Protein backbone atom coordinates (compact mmCIF):
# COMPACT_ATOMS: atom_id res chain seq x y z
CA UNK A 1 0.00 0.00 0.00
CA UNK A 2 2.98 2.36 0.34
CA UNK A 3 4.91 1.27 -2.76
CA UNK A 4 2.06 2.73 -4.89
CA UNK A 5 2.00 6.17 -6.50
CA UNK A 6 3.10 9.28 -4.66
CA UNK A 7 2.10 7.99 -1.17
CA UNK A 8 3.39 10.40 1.42
CA UNK A 9 2.99 13.53 -0.74
CA UNK A 10 0.34 16.23 -1.13
CA UNK A 11 -0.48 14.74 -4.56
CA UNK A 12 -1.78 11.43 -3.16
CA UNK A 13 -5.39 10.30 -3.14
CA UNK A 14 -7.22 10.24 0.22
CA UNK A 15 -6.75 7.00 2.14
CA UNK A 16 -8.76 5.13 4.76
CA UNK A 17 -7.57 3.92 8.16
CA UNK A 18 -6.23 0.62 6.78
CA UNK A 19 -4.39 2.35 3.92
CA UNK A 20 -6.92 1.63 1.17
CA UNK A 21 -7.92 4.57 -0.99
CA UNK A 22 -11.15 6.39 -0.24
CA UNK A 23 -14.30 4.84 -1.75
CA UNK A 24 -12.04 1.91 -2.66
CA UNK A 25 -10.52 4.02 -5.42
CA UNK A 26 -7.66 2.84 -7.64
CA UNK A 27 -5.40 4.61 -10.10
CA UNK A 28 -6.89 3.00 -13.24
CA UNK A 29 -10.45 4.18 -12.57
CA UNK A 30 -11.76 6.68 -15.15
CA UNK A 31 -12.43 9.39 -12.53
CA UNK A 32 -10.23 11.50 -10.26
CA UNK A 33 -11.01 11.82 -6.55
CA UNK A 34 -10.73 15.08 -4.60
CA UNK A 35 -7.96 15.54 -2.03
CA UNK A 36 -9.09 15.85 1.58
Amino acid sequence: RGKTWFAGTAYDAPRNADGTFKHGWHWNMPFSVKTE
Binding site: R1, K3, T4, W5, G19, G24, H26, W27, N28
Partner: protein, 406 residues
Protein backbone atom coordinates in the same frame (compact mmCIF):
# COMPACT_ATOMS: atom_id res chain seq x y z
CA UNK B 1 -7.30 -75.67 -40.94
CA UNK B 2 -7.19 -72.35 -39.10
CA UNK B 3 -4.99 -72.91 -35.95
CA UNK B 4 -5.18 -70.85 -32.71
CA UNK B 5 -2.13 -68.78 -33.61
CA UNK B 6 -3.76 -67.63 -36.85
CA UNK B 7 -7.09 -66.91 -35.13
CA UNK B 8 -5.08 -64.58 -32.86
CA UNK B 9 -3.38 -63.10 -35.95
CA UNK B 10 -6.80 -62.49 -37.60
CA UNK B 11 -7.84 -60.64 -34.43
CA UNK B 12 -4.65 -58.55 -34.75
CA UNK B 13 -5.55 -57.75 -38.38
CA UNK B 14 -9.07 -56.55 -37.56
CA UNK B 15 -7.82 -54.69 -34.46
CA UNK B 16 -5.14 -52.56 -36.11
CA UNK B 17 -7.10 -52.10 -39.36
CA UNK B 18 -9.76 -50.33 -37.28
CA UNK B 19 -6.95 -48.12 -35.90
CA UNK B 20 -5.68 -47.34 -39.42
CA UNK B 21 -9.23 -46.52 -40.52
CA UNK B 22 -9.77 -44.11 -37.61
CA UNK B 23 -6.41 -42.44 -38.23
CA UNK B 24 -7.09 -41.71 -41.89
CA UNK B 25 -10.68 -40.68 -41.11
CA UNK B 26 -9.11 -38.10 -38.77
CA UNK B 27 -6.34 -36.91 -41.14
CA UNK B 28 -8.55 -36.62 -44.27
CA UNK B 29 -10.13 -33.35 -43.10
CA UNK B 30 -6.71 -31.64 -43.11
CA UNK B 31 -5.23 -33.60 -46.03
CA UNK B 32 -6.95 -31.46 -48.66
CA UNK B 33 -6.69 -27.85 -47.41
CA UNK B 34 -3.99 -27.45 -44.73
CA UNK B 35 -3.92 -23.67 -45.24
CA UNK B 36 -7.54 -23.74 -44.05
CA UNK B 37 -6.09 -24.38 -40.59
CA UNK B 38 -4.62 -20.86 -40.63
CA UNK B 39 -6.49 -18.83 -43.27
CA UNK B 40 -9.86 -19.57 -41.62
CA UNK B 41 -10.03 -16.03 -40.18
CA UNK B 42 -9.33 -14.47 -43.59
CA UNK B 43 -11.85 -16.79 -45.25
CA UNK B 44 -14.53 -15.87 -42.70
CA UNK B 45 -13.72 -12.19 -43.26
CA UNK B 46 -14.14 -12.73 -47.01
CA UNK B 47 -17.44 -14.47 -46.24
CA UNK B 48 -18.43 -11.30 -44.40
CA UNK B 49 -21.47 -10.64 -42.24
CA UNK B 50 -24.44 -13.00 -42.21
CA UNK B 51 -27.96 -11.60 -42.20
CA UNK B 52 -29.66 -13.14 -39.17
CA UNK B 53 -32.75 -14.86 -40.65
CA UNK B 54 -34.69 -15.24 -37.50
CA UNK B 55 -38.37 -14.16 -37.36
CA UNK B 56 -37.69 -11.63 -34.57
CA UNK B 57 -34.88 -9.99 -36.56
CA UNK B 58 -37.04 -10.10 -39.71
CA UNK B 59 -39.84 -8.31 -37.84
CA UNK B 60 -37.25 -5.81 -36.57
CA UNK B 61 -36.13 -5.13 -40.15
CA UNK B 62 -39.75 -4.90 -41.30
CA UNK B 63 -40.81 -2.40 -38.63
CA UNK B 64 -37.79 -0.35 -37.56
CA UNK B 65 -35.57 -1.05 -40.57
CA UNK B 66 -32.71 -2.15 -38.32
CA UNK B 67 -30.82 -5.15 -39.71
CA UNK B 68 -29.42 -7.72 -37.29
CA UNK B 69 -26.12 -9.14 -38.54
CA UNK B 70 -24.01 -11.97 -37.14
CA UNK B 71 -20.41 -13.01 -37.73
CA UNK B 72 -18.57 -16.34 -37.74
CA UNK B 73 -16.65 -17.33 -34.62
CA UNK B 74 -13.26 -16.77 -36.29
CA UNK B 75 -13.88 -13.10 -37.05
CA UNK B 76 -15.75 -12.86 -33.73
CA UNK B 77 -12.55 -13.74 -31.88
CA UNK B 78 -10.57 -11.52 -34.26
CA UNK B 79 -12.86 -8.61 -33.31
CA UNK B 80 -12.38 -9.52 -29.64
CA UNK B 81 -8.61 -9.72 -30.08
CA UNK B 82 -6.79 -10.22 -26.79
CA UNK B 83 -10.04 -9.51 -24.95
CA UNK B 84 -10.48 -8.11 -21.46
CA UNK B 85 -6.97 -9.00 -20.34
CA UNK B 86 -5.68 -6.97 -17.41
CA UNK B 87 -2.22 -6.66 -19.02
CA UNK B 88 -3.32 -6.47 -22.67
CA UNK B 89 -1.63 -3.09 -23.19
CA UNK B 90 1.89 -3.91 -21.96
CA UNK B 91 2.29 -7.11 -23.99
CA UNK B 92 4.08 -7.51 -27.30
CA UNK B 93 2.04 -7.58 -30.54
CA UNK B 94 3.33 -11.11 -31.31
CA UNK B 95 2.26 -12.40 -27.88
CA UNK B 96 -1.09 -10.61 -28.23
CA UNK B 97 -1.71 -12.15 -31.67
CA UNK B 98 -0.79 -15.62 -30.41
CA UNK B 99 -2.99 -15.32 -27.30
CA UNK B 100 -5.90 -14.07 -29.43
CA UNK B 101 -5.49 -16.94 -31.90
CA UNK B 102 -5.23 -19.71 -29.28
CA UNK B 103 -8.05 -18.35 -27.09
CA UNK B 104 -10.23 -17.94 -30.18
CA UNK B 105 -9.48 -21.51 -31.21
CA UNK B 106 -10.53 -22.65 -27.72
CA UNK B 107 -13.73 -20.59 -27.65
CA UNK B 108 -14.66 -21.63 -31.20
CA UNK B 109 -13.75 -25.33 -31.45
CA UNK B 110 -14.56 -26.19 -27.83
CA UNK B 111 -17.83 -24.25 -27.65
CA UNK B 112 -20.76 -25.62 -25.56
CA UNK B 113 -18.30 -27.54 -23.34
CA UNK B 114 -15.64 -24.92 -22.44
CA UNK B 115 -15.99 -24.13 -18.74
CA UNK B 116 -14.00 -21.76 -16.62
CA UNK B 117 -11.68 -23.60 -14.23
CA UNK B 118 -12.96 -23.70 -10.61
CA UNK B 119 -12.10 -20.42 -8.94
CA UNK B 120 -11.17 -22.06 -5.62
CA UNK B 121 -8.18 -23.68 -7.36
CA UNK B 122 -6.53 -20.69 -9.06
CA UNK B 123 -8.63 -17.53 -8.76
CA UNK B 124 -9.55 -17.51 -5.06
CA UNK B 125 -5.81 -17.62 -4.30
CA UNK B 126 -5.27 -14.57 -6.51
CA UNK B 127 -3.16 -16.35 -9.13
CA UNK B 128 -5.17 -14.94 -12.06
CA UNK B 129 -3.02 -11.79 -11.91
CA UNK B 130 0.11 -11.70 -9.73
CA UNK B 131 2.49 -8.74 -9.35
CA UNK B 132 6.02 -8.87 -7.94
CA UNK B 133 5.70 -5.75 -5.81
CA UNK B 134 2.33 -6.90 -4.38
CA UNK B 135 2.68 -10.61 -3.52
CA UNK B 136 0.10 -10.50 -0.71
CA UNK B 137 -2.72 -8.95 -2.83
CA UNK B 138 -2.96 -5.90 -0.57
CA UNK B 139 -4.29 -3.79 -3.48
CA UNK B 140 -7.12 -6.20 -4.47
CA UNK B 141 -5.42 -7.13 -7.74
CA UNK B 142 -5.07 -3.50 -8.87
CA UNK B 143 -1.30 -3.29 -8.32
CA UNK B 144 -0.55 -3.33 -12.07
CA UNK B 145 -1.86 0.24 -12.35
CA UNK B 146 -1.71 1.24 -8.67
CA UNK B 147 2.07 0.78 -8.38
CA UNK B 148 4.57 2.45 -10.75
CA UNK B 149 7.29 0.32 -12.27
CA UNK B 150 10.47 0.10 -10.12
CA UNK B 151 13.45 2.32 -10.76
CA UNK B 152 16.69 0.71 -11.89
CA UNK B 153 18.52 -0.91 -8.99
CA UNK B 154 15.74 0.06 -6.56
CA UNK B 155 14.22 -2.92 -4.72
CA UNK B 156 11.57 -4.70 -6.76
CA UNK B 157 13.46 -4.26 -10.02
CA UNK B 158 12.75 -5.93 -12.40
CA UNK B 159 8.99 -6.21 -11.79
CA UNK B 160 7.38 -9.49 -12.87
CA UNK B 161 3.66 -9.65 -13.68
CA UNK B 162 1.88 -12.90 -14.58
CA UNK B 163 -1.67 -13.20 -15.89
CA UNK B 164 -3.23 -16.66 -16.15
CA UNK B 165 -6.30 -18.02 -17.92
CA UNK B 166 -7.28 -21.60 -17.04
CA UNK B 167 -10.20 -23.37 -18.73
CA UNK B 168 -11.71 -26.85 -18.74
CA UNK B 169 -13.56 -28.81 -21.42
CA UNK B 170 -15.07 -32.23 -22.11
CA UNK B 171 -11.81 -33.77 -23.37
CA UNK B 172 -9.38 -31.38 -21.65
CA UNK B 173 -8.85 -31.11 -17.90
CA UNK B 174 -6.81 -27.89 -18.08
CA UNK B 175 -6.28 -25.40 -20.90
CA UNK B 176 -3.77 -22.94 -19.45
CA UNK B 177 -2.44 -19.69 -20.92
CA UNK B 178 0.17 -17.81 -18.89
CA UNK B 179 1.55 -14.41 -19.92
CA UNK B 180 4.54 -13.11 -17.96
CA UNK B 181 6.12 -9.68 -18.29
CA UNK B 182 9.29 -8.15 -16.88
CA UNK B 183 10.92 -4.73 -17.00
CA UNK B 184 14.01 -5.85 -18.94
CA UNK B 185 11.93 -6.43 -22.09
CA UNK B 186 11.42 -10.11 -21.46
CA UNK B 187 7.96 -11.55 -22.18
CA UNK B 188 6.89 -15.19 -21.86
CA UNK B 189 3.85 -16.98 -23.29
CA UNK B 190 3.14 -20.47 -21.93
CA UNK B 191 0.17 -22.35 -23.42
CA UNK B 192 -0.45 -25.94 -22.32
CA UNK B 193 -3.51 -28.07 -23.13
CA UNK B 194 -3.95 -31.19 -20.96
CA UNK B 195 -6.18 -34.11 -21.94
CA UNK B 196 -7.95 -35.93 -19.13
CA UNK B 197 -6.80 -39.23 -17.65
CA UNK B 198 -9.17 -41.18 -19.88
CA UNK B 199 -7.89 -40.25 -23.36
CA UNK B 200 -4.87 -41.55 -25.27
CA UNK B 201 -4.08 -37.99 -26.29
CA UNK B 202 -0.85 -35.96 -26.27
CA UNK B 203 -0.39 -32.79 -24.26
CA UNK B 204 -0.17 -29.65 -26.37
CA UNK B 205 2.61 -27.24 -25.43
CA UNK B 206 3.87 -23.84 -26.56
CA UNK B 207 6.46 -21.49 -25.05
CA UNK B 208 7.36 -18.13 -26.61
CA UNK B 209 10.22 -16.34 -24.83
CA UNK B 210 11.24 -12.93 -26.16
CA UNK B 211 13.78 -10.38 -24.96
CA UNK B 212 13.21 -6.66 -25.69
CA UNK B 213 10.71 -7.34 -28.47
CA UNK B 214 12.91 -9.88 -30.29
CA UNK B 215 11.85 -13.52 -30.11
CA UNK B 216 14.64 -15.64 -28.63
CA UNK B 217 12.88 -18.99 -28.10
CA UNK B 218 9.78 -20.41 -29.78
CA UNK B 219 8.68 -23.96 -28.94
CA UNK B 220 5.54 -25.74 -30.14
CA UNK B 221 4.98 -29.44 -29.53
CA UNK B 222 2.45 -32.23 -29.15
CA UNK B 223 4.27 -33.93 -26.28
CA UNK B 224 3.38 -37.65 -26.16
CA UNK B 225 2.06 -39.51 -23.13
CA UNK B 226 2.93 -43.08 -24.12
CA UNK B 227 5.81 -45.16 -22.76
CA UNK B 228 7.76 -45.28 -26.05
CA UNK B 229 7.64 -41.46 -26.48
CA UNK B 230 5.85 -41.73 -29.84
CA UNK B 231 2.60 -40.24 -31.09
CA UNK B 232 -0.30 -41.75 -32.97
CA UNK B 233 -0.07 -41.97 -36.79
CA UNK B 234 -2.66 -39.21 -37.22
CA UNK B 235 -0.61 -36.87 -35.01
CA UNK B 236 2.61 -37.72 -36.88
CA UNK B 237 0.97 -37.26 -40.30
CA UNK B 238 -0.70 -33.98 -39.28
CA UNK B 239 2.50 -32.54 -37.79
CA UNK B 240 4.60 -33.53 -40.82
CA UNK B 241 1.98 -32.16 -43.24
CA UNK B 242 1.71 -28.86 -41.36
CA UNK B 243 5.50 -28.52 -41.18
CA UNK B 244 5.70 -29.10 -44.95
CA UNK B 245 2.84 -26.65 -45.54
CA UNK B 246 3.98 -23.73 -43.39
CA UNK B 247 7.68 -24.08 -42.55
CA UNK B 248 8.52 -24.50 -46.28
CA UNK B 249 12.12 -23.31 -46.26
CA UNK B 250 14.63 -22.66 -43.43
CA UNK B 251 17.17 -25.13 -42.05
CA UNK B 252 15.75 -28.66 -41.69
CA UNK B 253 17.05 -29.64 -38.23
CA UNK B 254 16.47 -26.53 -36.03
CA UNK B 255 16.51 -28.57 -32.80
CA UNK B 256 19.15 -27.87 -30.17
CA UNK B 257 17.55 -30.35 -27.69
CA UNK B 258 18.84 -28.54 -24.54
CA UNK B 259 19.07 -31.73 -22.40
CA UNK B 260 15.60 -31.35 -20.82
CA UNK B 261 13.17 -31.76 -23.72
CA UNK B 262 14.51 -35.19 -24.71
CA UNK B 263 12.16 -36.91 -22.25
CA UNK B 264 9.01 -35.12 -23.47
CA UNK B 265 9.58 -33.92 -27.03
CA UNK B 266 7.87 -35.57 -29.98
CA UNK B 267 9.99 -36.58 -33.01
CA UNK B 268 8.37 -33.68 -34.92
CA UNK B 269 8.59 -31.16 -32.06
CA UNK B 270 9.57 -27.62 -33.02
CA UNK B 271 11.98 -25.59 -30.87
CA UNK B 272 13.48 -22.67 -32.79
CA UNK B 273 15.28 -19.41 -32.16
CA UNK B 274 13.55 -17.13 -34.71
CA UNK B 275 15.95 -15.13 -36.90
CA UNK B 276 13.83 -12.96 -39.16
CA UNK B 277 10.24 -11.75 -39.48
CA UNK B 278 9.65 -14.33 -42.23
CA UNK B 279 10.70 -17.21 -39.96
CA UNK B 280 8.67 -15.75 -37.08
CA UNK B 281 5.60 -15.48 -39.33
CA UNK B 282 6.08 -19.05 -40.57
CA UNK B 283 6.35 -20.30 -36.98
CA UNK B 284 3.23 -18.37 -35.93
CA UNK B 285 1.25 -19.78 -38.86
CA UNK B 286 2.47 -23.32 -38.12
CA UNK B 287 1.68 -23.04 -34.46
CA UNK B 288 -1.84 -21.65 -34.97
CA UNK B 289 -2.50 -24.36 -37.58
CA UNK B 290 -1.17 -27.13 -35.33
CA UNK B 291 -3.29 -25.90 -32.41
CA UNK B 292 -6.39 -25.80 -34.63
CA UNK B 293 -5.67 -29.31 -35.92
CA UNK B 294 -5.18 -30.58 -32.35
CA UNK B 295 -8.48 -29.04 -31.22
CA UNK B 296 -10.29 -30.34 -34.32
CA UNK B 297 -9.04 -33.88 -33.65
CA UNK B 298 -10.20 -33.41 -30.05
CA UNK B 299 -13.84 -33.40 -31.22
CA UNK B 300 -14.07 -37.10 -32.10
CA UNK B 301 -11.94 -38.41 -29.21
CA UNK B 302 -13.50 -41.26 -27.23
CA UNK B 303 -12.57 -41.82 -23.55
CA UNK B 304 -10.91 -45.07 -22.49
CA UNK B 305 -12.81 -46.99 -19.81
CA UNK B 306 -11.67 -50.10 -17.95
CA UNK B 307 -12.51 -52.31 -14.99
CA UNK B 308 -14.47 -55.48 -15.71
CA UNK B 309 -13.96 -57.42 -18.91
CA UNK B 310 -10.48 -56.43 -20.06
CA UNK B 311 -7.29 -55.05 -18.53
CA UNK B 312 -5.42 -53.62 -21.54
CA UNK B 313 -7.59 -50.51 -21.15
CA UNK B 314 -6.43 -50.30 -17.53
CA UNK B 315 -2.84 -50.61 -18.74
CA UNK B 316 -3.52 -47.81 -21.23
CA UNK B 317 -4.96 -45.63 -18.44
CA UNK B 318 -1.91 -46.29 -16.26
CA UNK B 319 0.31 -45.40 -19.23
CA UNK B 320 -1.64 -42.15 -19.71
CA UNK B 321 -1.27 -41.25 -16.02
CA UNK B 322 2.44 -42.10 -16.06
CA UNK B 323 3.02 -40.02 -19.20
CA UNK B 324 1.21 -37.03 -17.73
CA UNK B 325 3.18 -37.39 -14.49
CA UNK B 326 6.42 -37.61 -16.49
CA UNK B 327 5.54 -34.45 -18.44
CA UNK B 328 4.62 -32.59 -15.23
CA UNK B 329 7.83 -33.69 -13.47
CA UNK B 330 9.98 -32.78 -16.49
CA UNK B 331 8.37 -29.34 -16.52
CA UNK B 332 8.91 -29.12 -12.74
CA UNK B 333 12.66 -29.90 -12.94
CA UNK B 334 12.89 -26.98 -15.40
CA UNK B 335 14.40 -24.81 -12.58
CA UNK B 336 17.68 -24.28 -14.51
CA UNK B 337 15.43 -22.23 -16.84
CA UNK B 338 12.02 -20.42 -16.69
CA UNK B 339 11.82 -20.72 -12.88
CA UNK B 340 14.57 -18.05 -12.84
CA UNK B 341 11.88 -15.58 -13.92
CA UNK B 342 10.35 -16.54 -10.57
CA UNK B 343 12.26 -16.37 -7.21
CA UNK B 344 11.55 -12.64 -7.50
CA UNK B 345 8.11 -13.73 -6.28
CA UNK B 346 9.77 -15.82 -3.55
CA UNK B 347 10.87 -19.46 -3.54
CA UNK B 348 8.10 -21.00 -1.43
CA UNK B 349 5.51 -19.08 -3.45
CA UNK B 350 7.25 -20.35 -6.59
CA UNK B 351 6.79 -23.91 -5.32
CA UNK B 352 3.15 -23.23 -4.30
CA UNK B 353 2.51 -21.91 -7.81
CA UNK B 354 4.44 -24.52 -9.80
CA UNK B 355 2.98 -27.57 -8.08
CA UNK B 356 -0.61 -26.32 -7.76
CA UNK B 357 -1.16 -24.54 -11.06
CA UNK B 358 0.19 -25.29 -14.56
CA UNK B 359 1.80 -28.72 -14.18
CA UNK B 360 -0.37 -30.46 -11.58
CA UNK B 361 -1.04 -34.20 -11.49
CA UNK B 362 -3.56 -36.04 -9.32
CA UNK B 363 -5.32 -39.41 -9.74
CA UNK B 364 -8.35 -38.42 -7.66
CA UNK B 365 -9.19 -34.89 -8.88
CA UNK B 366 -10.85 -34.50 -12.27
CA UNK B 367 -12.27 -30.98 -12.82
CA UNK B 368 -16.02 -30.88 -13.46
CA UNK B 369 -17.30 -29.63 -16.79
CA UNK B 370 -20.65 -28.39 -18.10
CA UNK B 371 -21.43 -29.77 -21.57
CA UNK B 372 -24.47 -27.73 -22.55
CA UNK B 373 -24.83 -28.97 -26.16
CA UNK B 374 -28.44 -27.69 -26.23
CA UNK B 375 -27.59 -24.11 -27.20
CA UNK B 376 -27.12 -25.66 -30.65
CA UNK B 377 -30.75 -26.82 -30.45
CA UNK B 378 -31.96 -23.39 -29.28
CA UNK B 379 -30.06 -21.55 -32.03
CA UNK B 380 -31.26 -24.07 -34.62
CA UNK B 381 -34.88 -23.58 -33.59
CA UNK B 382 -34.46 -19.82 -33.57
CA UNK B 383 -33.15 -20.05 -37.14
CA UNK B 384 -35.79 -22.59 -38.29
CA UNK B 385 -38.85 -22.39 -36.02
CA UNK B 386 -42.35 -23.84 -36.23
CA UNK B 387 -45.21 -21.36 -36.04
CA UNK B 388 -48.27 -23.52 -35.31
CA UNK B 389 -51.43 -24.66 -37.06
CA UNK B 390 -53.05 -21.21 -37.11
CA UNK B 391 -50.01 -19.71 -38.83
CA UNK B 392 -50.04 -22.67 -41.23
CA UNK B 393 -53.66 -21.83 -42.11
CA UNK B 394 -52.77 -18.15 -42.56
CA UNK B 395 -49.85 -19.07 -44.83
CA UNK B 396 -52.16 -21.36 -46.81
CA UNK B 397 -54.57 -18.44 -47.29
CA UNK B 398 -51.67 -16.19 -48.35
CA UNK B 399 -50.34 -18.80 -50.80
CA UNK B 400 -53.80 -19.21 -52.31
CA UNK B 401 -54.11 -15.43 -52.64
CA UNK B 402 -50.76 -15.12 -54.42
CA UNK B 403 -51.65 -18.06 -56.67
CA UNK B 404 -54.99 -16.48 -57.63
CA UNK B 405 -53.46 -12.99 -58.02
CA UNK B 406 -49.99 -13.39 -59.56
Amino acid sequence: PLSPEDIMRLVQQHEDVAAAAESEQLVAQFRDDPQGLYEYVNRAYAEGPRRVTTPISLLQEEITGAVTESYPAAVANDIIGMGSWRLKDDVDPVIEFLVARLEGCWREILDTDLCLYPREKWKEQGWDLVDSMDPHQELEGFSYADIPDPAKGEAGYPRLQLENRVYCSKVFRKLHVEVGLRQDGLQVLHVVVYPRYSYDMPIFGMDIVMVDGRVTLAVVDCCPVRADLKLQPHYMETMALLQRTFLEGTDPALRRIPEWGSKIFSPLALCITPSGPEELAAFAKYAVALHRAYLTMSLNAVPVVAGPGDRREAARLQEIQDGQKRFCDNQLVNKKTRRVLEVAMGVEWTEAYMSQLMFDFDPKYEPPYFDASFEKLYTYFDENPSFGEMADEAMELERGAEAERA
